[PDB]
Each structure stands twice: as C-alpha cells, then as structure tokens.
C-alpha cells in the first residue's frame, strides 16, 4: 500500500529506519551536483512525536562527513520544516514504506527559492520501474530529466 504524508491514512512510524539516497533532482541543478550543499546521502530517519531526525553524510574529495538535522512538524499535516542552508519545508508525496520514499522539498535562501526532489530506498538501489515512477513525479513538478541525478553508484562511504 502507498501513501502520501499529506494523506489521511499516512502512518509516519512506518518511514522510521534505514534509508539510502538513490536519485536526487532539482530545478537548480548546481544544488545537487558534486559540490552542492543538497547532494545529501540519507542514512536513516528517526521518527519522534513531532519531529523526524534525519542522518546524512556529504562527500568531498572522496571523504564522507556526517550531519544530522531535526525536521519539525508544521501547521500542515504531512509537512515538515528544517533549517539547513536556508529555510526548508518538505512533504513525502509518495512512499510504499517498504521499498521507496519520494520527498519534495522547497528551499528558500537569500530571498530566492528552488525545488528539490529525492528518491530514497530501503536498500542502496531501487528497480528501474520505481526510478521511472520518480521521473514521472519530477515531471509533474516541472523538473526535467536532465536535472535528475542517479546517485546509486555513489551513495556509499
Ligand atoms: Na551558481
Ligand atoms: Na544495484
Ligand atoms: Na504523470
């Protein structure tokens, strides 16, 4: 069964645990390119009463650097906010809990904005069918495939 974080039947406890960054996408491609601040490799999501603790690592010159962020629930169900390289809010438009998680985030910094979409998997990779479903979801948000980057062969330290 699939759900959206903004849907009535969403069960946030079910996204707890191990996750891996499979694909990242953005309408500002530089943000997820090699030295981008949003080229983030997820490791786990810890679900709390009104927050999610996100554990990630970034990579630079082949060196991994850990980072944790706390995302707080906002006034809208299914929406979380977090301060990181500006102000971010995000939702999970689609997850099946057991294989994949698709997130949609809006970043605002210095009076600007951009959209970030991420495809996360329970294992370090996902099937081609799930990756195509993600490309379709990015298209629905106006993000071209040329701005979608598969990081499945670069998500391990
Ligand atoms: Na730039
Ligand atoms: Na694989
Ligand atoms: Na579509």
């Amino acid at each position: 069964e699939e759900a959206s974080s903004t849907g009535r039947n969403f069960n946030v406890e079910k996204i707890n645990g191990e996750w891996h960054t499979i694909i990242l996408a953005s309408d500002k491609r530089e943000k997820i390119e090699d030295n981008g601040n949003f080229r983030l490799f997820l490791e786990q999501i810890h679900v709390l009463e009104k927050s999610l603790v996100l554990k990630f690592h970034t990579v630079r010159d082949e060196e991994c650097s850990e980072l944790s962020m706390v995302a707080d629930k906002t006034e809208k169900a299914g929406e979380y906010s977090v301060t990181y390289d500006g102000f971010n809010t995000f939702t999970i438009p689609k997850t099946d809990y057991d294989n994949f998680l698709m997130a949609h985030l809006i970043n605002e910094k210095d009076g600007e904005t951009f959209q970030l979409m991420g495809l996360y998997g329970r294992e370090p990779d996902l099937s081609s069918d799930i990756k195509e479903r993600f490309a379709q979801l990015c298209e629905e948000h106006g993000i071209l495939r040329e701005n979608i980057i598969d990081l499945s062969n670069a998500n391990r330290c």
Side-chain angles (χ1 to χ4, degrees):
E1 67 285 352
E2 302 189 349
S4 169
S5 66
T6 61
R8 207 58 173 296
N9 67 166
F10 182 61
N11 182 173
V12 67
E13 291 179 323
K14 287 192 180 187
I15 68 175
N16 184 72
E18 176 190 4
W19 286 104
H20 298 264
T21 293
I22 311 310
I23 304 180
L24 293 179
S26 178
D27 52 22
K28 276 188 187 181
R29 206 180 193 276
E30 52 174 301
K31 270 52 206 302
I32 53 162
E33 280 172 349
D34 280 50
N35 289 154
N37 292 169
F38 287 83
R39 172 181 274 256
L40 293 162
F41 296 94
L42 186 59
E43 299 171 0
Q44 64 178 296
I45 292 179
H46 194 59
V47 175
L48 298 175
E49 302 186 0
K50 282 190 170 181
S51 60
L52 299 177
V53 178
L54 312 179
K55 289 188 183 178
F56 299 93
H57 70 260
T58 52
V59 178
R60 50 78 59 181
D61 300 66
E62 297 180 60
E63 184 185 296
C64 279
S65 178
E66 303 286 61
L67 54 167
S68 285
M69 289 179 204
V70 173
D72 295 304
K73 296 188 60 56
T74 71
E75 296 187 300
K76 42 179 70 59
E79 193 184 63
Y80 293 82
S81 66
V82 64
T83 296
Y84 173 77
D85 195 30
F87 174 68
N88 309 280
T89 58
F90 67 88
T91 57
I92 296 171
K94 190 60 56 184
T95 176
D96 71 342
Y97 306 115
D98 300 323
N99 291 286
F100 70 87
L101 189 154
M102 302 191 186
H104 174 266
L105 172 153
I106 294 297
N107 173 267
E108 291 174 342
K109 65 119 60 303
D110 298 322
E112 306 203 308
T113 196
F114 75 86
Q115 306 182 271
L116 177 300
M117 303 205 69
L119 176 61
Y120 302 96
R122 292 297 200 172
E123 300 187 349
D125 200 0
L126 282 166
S127 64
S128 64
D129 294 325
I130 294 298
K131 293 187 182 179
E132 172 65 9
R133 289 185 63 193
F134 183 65
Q136 295 296 145
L137 182 69
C138 291
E139 182 177 351
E140 288 176 330
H141 290 267
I143 297 166
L144 290 172
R145 281 163 190 259
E146 63 182 56
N147 286 166
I148 297 174
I149 305 176
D150 186 320
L151 292 171
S152 62
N153 293 300
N155 53 181
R156 304 179 191 59
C157 292

